Amino acid sequence: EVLITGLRTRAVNVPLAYPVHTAVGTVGTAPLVLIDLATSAGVVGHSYLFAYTPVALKSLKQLLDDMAAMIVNEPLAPVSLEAMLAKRFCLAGYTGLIRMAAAGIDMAAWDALGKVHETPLVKLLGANARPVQAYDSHSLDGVKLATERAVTAAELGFRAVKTKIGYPALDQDLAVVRSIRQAVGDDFGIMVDYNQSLDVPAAIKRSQALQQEGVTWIEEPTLQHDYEGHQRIQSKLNVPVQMGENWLGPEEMFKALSIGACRLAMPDAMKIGGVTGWIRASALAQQFGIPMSSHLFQEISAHLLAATPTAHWLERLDLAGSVIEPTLTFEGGNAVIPDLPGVGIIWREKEIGKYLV
Amino acid sequence: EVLITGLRTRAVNVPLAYPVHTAVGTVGTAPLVLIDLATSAGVVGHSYLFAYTPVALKSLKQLLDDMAAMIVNEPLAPVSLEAMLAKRFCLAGYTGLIRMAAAGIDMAAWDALGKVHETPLVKLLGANARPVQAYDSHSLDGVKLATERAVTAAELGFRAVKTKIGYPALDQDLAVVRSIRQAVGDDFGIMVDYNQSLDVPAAIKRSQALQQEGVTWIEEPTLQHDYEGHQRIQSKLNVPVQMGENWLGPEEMFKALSIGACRLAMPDAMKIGGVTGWIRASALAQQFGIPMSSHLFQEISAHLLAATPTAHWLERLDLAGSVIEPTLTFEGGNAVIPDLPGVGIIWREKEIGKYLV
Amino acid sequence: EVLITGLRTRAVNVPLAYPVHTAVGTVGTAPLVLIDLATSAGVVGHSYLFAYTPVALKSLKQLLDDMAAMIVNEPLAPVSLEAMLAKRFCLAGYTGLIRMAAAGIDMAAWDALGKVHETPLVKLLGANARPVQAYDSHSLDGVKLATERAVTAAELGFRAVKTKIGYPALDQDLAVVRSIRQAVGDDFGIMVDYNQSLDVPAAIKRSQALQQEGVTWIEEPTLQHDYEGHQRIQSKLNVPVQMGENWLGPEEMFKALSIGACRLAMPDAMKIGGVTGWIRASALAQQFGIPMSSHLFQEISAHLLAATPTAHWLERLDLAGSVIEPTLTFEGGNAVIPDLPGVGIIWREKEIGKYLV
Amino acid sequence: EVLITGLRTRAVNVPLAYPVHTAVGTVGTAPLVLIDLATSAGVVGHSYLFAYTPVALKSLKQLLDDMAAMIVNEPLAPVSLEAMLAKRFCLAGYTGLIRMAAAGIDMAAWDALGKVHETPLVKLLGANARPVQAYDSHSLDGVKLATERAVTAAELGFRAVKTKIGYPALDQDLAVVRSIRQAVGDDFGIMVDYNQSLDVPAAIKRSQALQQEGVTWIEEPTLQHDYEGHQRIQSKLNVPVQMGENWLGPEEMFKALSIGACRLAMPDAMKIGGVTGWIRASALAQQFGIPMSSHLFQEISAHLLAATPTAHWLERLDLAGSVIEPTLTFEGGNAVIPDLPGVGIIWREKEIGKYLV
């Protein structure tokens, strides 16, 4: 009855006002693939994917354009579509870029379902829209720029910031944390992200120094696939270890949570498998007693976290603000869901043309 | 001193004389990406990648063409190159198609190193070339075609065949196995591959029936990422459970072997990370006491298994025979390594032009 | 094609400028067995073994002279040779002095392979030569001599020293550490080695006092074969426990790492099985997330660590400097690999004659 | 008061009437080192060591001759001597040939203690001499010679034989077992020894076939250091897995028994550390509920097993019968301890001269 009738993708490389500097490199632009999923009902679902590096951008678009053939004329039923794509990519490996592509389709298909039923996505999922507390996410900025951006964030109403660390010496890490505490006072949340840059001995040593400074969480201290090494770092800390942005699918989260790798989780809506993957991740987090935050994709994440029983923080990191209307607002440090059908993504069509690859 | 000076890729879609039918679909053609890695020494390394479905072919080529920029002018040092690519794809996710691309570069770079030193790859790795026992790999062919191809294989000298199973009823699975035993006698090896098609209860029930028929191994009875479910099936069997073709990198093998998912392993040279990933996988298999076979890539696998302490079987499944010279020969059911520098892959240039995508 | 044609060994007992004093005894001279492995290609591989005590020197030479018969006329293929010697010493026990002898042959055979191909060993193994940070290793020297040698080491550019401890009273241990920190300042690395001299209760008590002084690592606090006791000491510490110099073969390391005995590893190139044993140990250390350092054998270890993914520190302890040319240089506290075929060991033939046993 | 005053060793290579053929090689002669330990009391202790291969014979003698210096003028107190040698070989590695040498001294020192006190060793250890059931140990002899030697053994009164297996095909293994059962009837014990020749899958498959034939135990099915692999084979069998001949010291037995590698143990008096190592091994076996047999050294083992709470079988395999008087007798399949001071070893001095190396 409602069928998918087409899929269109556009690759843009959008400039970021502040380049996201991390201990392992800087993301200077946002390579995005914008997706339009057309339906027989005359509504169009929308989502975008984040390619991380321009090196993977054209490849991800090509893959989605070659996948269009298998979903056109399929019913608009995201849960049924996901099971079919899992099965078709059986042998190839339903992970990495293939999984990320399948999640962009899922996300657009749920946006289209909410437009067919004229309802906000959070309401379609059975929950009320509520304000979600947000922290402002900045990068490995050195003492002065990370302190300047942190003062700006408390002035816009945010109650927590995330800074990037993992400098050559532990002392540079603590300098940054201390200068931020100095400026924002003891009330404020300071989250720190190591971006997989340390080995386990080094991470135990640096994290116990940071724990004495009062940080909110320590994020991905070592290689992300090393769940056992994260459990070993976590076992020596009172402060929570946070991870999850790099889990591809609920099945990688299930393996990390099973061995107790972390006390907090932050799935990425694209890598976890879209809305379908998020509902499953959310059920796991509830049973393992894990507070759950989001990573990127703030527009759909404000909807998904209002439906997440152990919802914890939304990450504000605006990667697509240039090509979409600002329907998501932040008020007093909280994201406010727009009262729009679906997810509330509206393309700024003439900006897109400027950034086209 | 020896530098990489260029990378060229060509995507072909080659016809297979017998389409590889599996319980989850048929691979009717081989989508391959042929790689030429040029060096300052005037030698060219060669490898190919297998894309599994044509849907992923152009995307994988595009990715390799966009990656060329980061390895041109780097020293021809595969172990150092791999650590650098692992680090650059840190945030994106060093798995799936990205990992597969990086492995094609590794494999071509080791072929080029062996050509610089005028030595067969097995000798460069410090071992003697030896004949490696091979089994012939056929598909979900129904009773009559799988029995016909099995008689042909014993006539060419092979001592074991792999058939695909996972039919609607257990009885169809046993019919195929029985008709093959009937024709080849009790001496012959019959391996069976379920290609992830069963759930754990179903796999315990079918595998104990097959075990009473005397099969060599039962391969991937359930979803490949489910290592715990494979351990649960394995715990109820005397016959070995075989898996490993879908592990991306030695770190996924390490996780499966740690929980005792299988009694046999068969890494895929491309998914395990190339020659660099194979040497690491081989060290793990030796310590866990796991006999190690290969999956696809018979040309480089004959070299890698002669250097593998618990080497077990080579899988004969010729996906690129149309576009490369037959330097790998099978004699009395054993692969014989060619006495050629590197890996011994020589393009049949006018065939390639016929299959170009 | 390249065959081993002879093996010659010479036992020397070389004077050490500073006798290596440990909590369980002093190594006053270096009992070494120098090995020359002749090949049909007209190149000669070189290695030496360290006998620890003169009591074991003539026995180790005799063993190698009696083993010559089984490797002469075998192909120069170290990985194939190792599997054959493992098999021949099956019943006797492939450990202790037999394993150490087999490793001297491995090391000489890889040096000869690199000379056949005119390439540095690190390049033959597929990696780039890079500077490796080194620490200077001194002994149980008492407060004043260990402080004097530590000032000398920071003056030669080293950024860390290893001192020996395990005095009758904990207070003597801390005095030594404190006097060194006093002299070199808070930036410097101080590693401490107990040389198996404590029982587990005693080691928990002394290590938590040393941890409050800021040492880099605590090395072999109790009996080396007691992996469980090391795990019990490690579980009570933030500082890493270091061990590994006494593991014979990758299979003993595999057992220690499996139960989590230590957070750092330092295999000995001879006891771990030579270059072949090192590549396997290196794959294990990477999967268990263990930073890996070396023990003795600085010349070949500078090559092996440049090829080791979790490479951590090189131990400078020059046992054979009197009978080999100084091709290994230390610059700004880092070992610099010589640009010589193989390993770069060149006998000083008239010195050898002075030390001959 | 009683001091050790000298140590003398003689290396002989004695012909064996039946060469001990195993799946990994044949022991055609017995390379032995005969030890004479002189004391201030005017008594001389005696023991011999078994070198397994002539390749290790001269090296083991040399080592003992170089160790003489550290025990001459020490009190004749084996337990105190062992702790001192453990400590002196701290750094070198108290295992392999060094451990085997130290055990030859222990065994001679306990023989000398029993001669000082004019008492049989079993009585000095606090137990009564009792007959110990013995099995006759033969080799990989093929169907006809292993059946001929098994009939001879039942005729001399033995109630069990050990045969060697591990032929190219399982069918050859069962042929040998069946032909022996045929000849000796269903009452007789048939033990089988694989001598580490199988991998774990292969060992599960062959052992369940042998278990259906009724063998007494399956001995060392896989590599001896692989305790986990033995536990995995054992977990699939009703018949006991037997091992222990290759444990060097009670600390290796402790590790194997801790993970449940076997249901039966057979320490070797030399590799376990002599009489001192045997008393410790015996305490471990009792607590883990492990029936304990011996391996080789029948003369001292008849004494040690009469003092072993879970004593099970003595292995008859006469390696030194040519150079020692037959004071150990077998009567109705049981070893009968001689009523002689110490261990009852008396050199046949003119035979020794014939076999001298």
Ligand SMILES: C[C@@](O)(C(=O)O)c1ccccc1
């Ligand atoms: C810093 C990061 O790890 C995060 O948590 O926000 C991140 C990684 C990659 C791209 C954007 C953001």
Ligand SMILES: C[C@@](O)(C(=O)O)c1ccccc1
């Ligand atoms: C059947 C298979 O699982 C195998 O093991 O060969 C296989 C899967 C996919 C492509 C080729 C072969």
Ligand SMILES: C[C@@](O)(C(=O)O)c1ccccc1
């Ligand atoms: C002190 C030591 O344990 C080390 O780590 O260097 C060592 C032990 C034995 C000989 C040389 C060095």
Ligand SMILES: C[C@@](O)(C(=O)O)c1ccccc1
């Ligand atoms: C066969 C054997 O394993 C045994 O158990 O007796 C053995 C091994 C080596 C020498 C003699 C005997």
Ligand SMILES: [Mg+2]
């Ligand atoms: Mg992050």
Ligand SMILES: [Mg+2]
């Ligand atoms: Mg398969």
Ligand SMILES: [Mg+2]
């Ligand atoms: Mg040390």
Ligand SMILES: [Mg+2]
């Ligand atoms: Mg035996």
